[PDB]
Amino acid sequence: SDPSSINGGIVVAMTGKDCVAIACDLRLGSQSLGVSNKFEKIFHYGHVFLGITGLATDVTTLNEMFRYKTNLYKLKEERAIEPETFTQLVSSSLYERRFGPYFVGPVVAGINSKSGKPFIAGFDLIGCIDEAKDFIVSGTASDQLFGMCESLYEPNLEPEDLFETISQALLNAADRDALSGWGAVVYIIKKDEVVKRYLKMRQD
Amino acid sequence: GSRRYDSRTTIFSPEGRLYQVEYALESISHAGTAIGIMASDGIVLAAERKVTSTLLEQDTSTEKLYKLNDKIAVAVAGLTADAEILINTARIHAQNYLKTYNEDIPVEILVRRLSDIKQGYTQHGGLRPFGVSFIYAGYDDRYGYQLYTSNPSGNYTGWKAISVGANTSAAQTLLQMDYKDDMKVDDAIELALKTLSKTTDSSALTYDRLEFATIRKGANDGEVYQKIFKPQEIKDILVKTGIT
Amino acid sequence: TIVGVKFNNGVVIAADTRSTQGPIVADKNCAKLHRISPKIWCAGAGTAADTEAVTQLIGSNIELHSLYTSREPRVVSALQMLKQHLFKYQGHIGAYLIVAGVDPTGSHLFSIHAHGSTDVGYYLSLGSGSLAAMAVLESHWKQDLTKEEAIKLASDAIQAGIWNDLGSGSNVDVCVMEIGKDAEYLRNYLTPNVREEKQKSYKFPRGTTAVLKESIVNICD
Amino acid sequence: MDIILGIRVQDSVILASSKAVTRGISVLKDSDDKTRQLSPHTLMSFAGEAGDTVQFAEYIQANIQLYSIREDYELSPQAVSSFVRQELAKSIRSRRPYQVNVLIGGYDKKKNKPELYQIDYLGTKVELPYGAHGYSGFYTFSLLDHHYRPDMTTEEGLDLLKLCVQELEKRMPMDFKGVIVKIVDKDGIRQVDDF
Amino acid sequence: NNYDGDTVTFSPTGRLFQVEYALEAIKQGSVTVGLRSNTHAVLVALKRNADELSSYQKKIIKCDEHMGLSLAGLAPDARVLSNYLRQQCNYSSLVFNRKLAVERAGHLLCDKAQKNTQSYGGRPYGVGLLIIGYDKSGAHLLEFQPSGNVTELYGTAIGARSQGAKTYLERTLDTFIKIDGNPDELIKAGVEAISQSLRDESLTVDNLSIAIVGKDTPFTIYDGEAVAKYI
Amino acid sequence: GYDRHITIFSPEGRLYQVEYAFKATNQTNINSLAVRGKDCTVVISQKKVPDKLLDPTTVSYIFCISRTIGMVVNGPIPDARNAALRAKAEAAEFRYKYGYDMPCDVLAKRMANLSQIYTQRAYMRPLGVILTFVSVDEELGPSIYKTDPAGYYVGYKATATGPKQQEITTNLENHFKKSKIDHINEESWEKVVEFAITHMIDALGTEFSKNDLEVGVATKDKFFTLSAENIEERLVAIAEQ
Amino acid sequence: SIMAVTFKDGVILGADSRTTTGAYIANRVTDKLTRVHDKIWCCRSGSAADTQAIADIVQYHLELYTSQYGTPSTETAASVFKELCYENKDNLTAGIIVAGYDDKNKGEVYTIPLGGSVHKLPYAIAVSGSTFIYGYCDKNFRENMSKEETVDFIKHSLSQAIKWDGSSGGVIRMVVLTAAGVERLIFYPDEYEQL
Amino acid sequence: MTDRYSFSLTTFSPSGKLGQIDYALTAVKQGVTSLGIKATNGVVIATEKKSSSPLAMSETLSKVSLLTPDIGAVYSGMGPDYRVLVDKSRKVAHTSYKRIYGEYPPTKLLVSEVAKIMQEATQSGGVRPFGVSLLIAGHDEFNGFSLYQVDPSGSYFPWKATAIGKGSVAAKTFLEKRWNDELELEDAIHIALLTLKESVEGEFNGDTIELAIIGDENPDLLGYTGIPTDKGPRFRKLTSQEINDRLEAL
Amino acid sequence: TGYDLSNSVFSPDGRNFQVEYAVKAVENGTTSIGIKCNDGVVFAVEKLITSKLLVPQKNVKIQVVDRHIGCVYSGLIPDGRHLVNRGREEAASFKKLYKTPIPIPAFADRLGQYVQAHTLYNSVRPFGVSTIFGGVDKNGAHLYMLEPSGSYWGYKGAATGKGRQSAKAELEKLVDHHPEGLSAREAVKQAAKIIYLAHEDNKEKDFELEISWCSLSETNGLHKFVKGDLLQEAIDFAQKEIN
Ligand SMILES: [Cl-]
Ligand SMILES: [Cl-]
Ligand SMILES: [Cl-]
Ligand SMILES: [Mg+2]
Ligand SMILES: [Mg+2]
Ligand SMILES: [Mg+2]
Question: Do H and F have ≥3 inter-chain CB pairs under 8 A?
Answer without folding.
Answer: yes
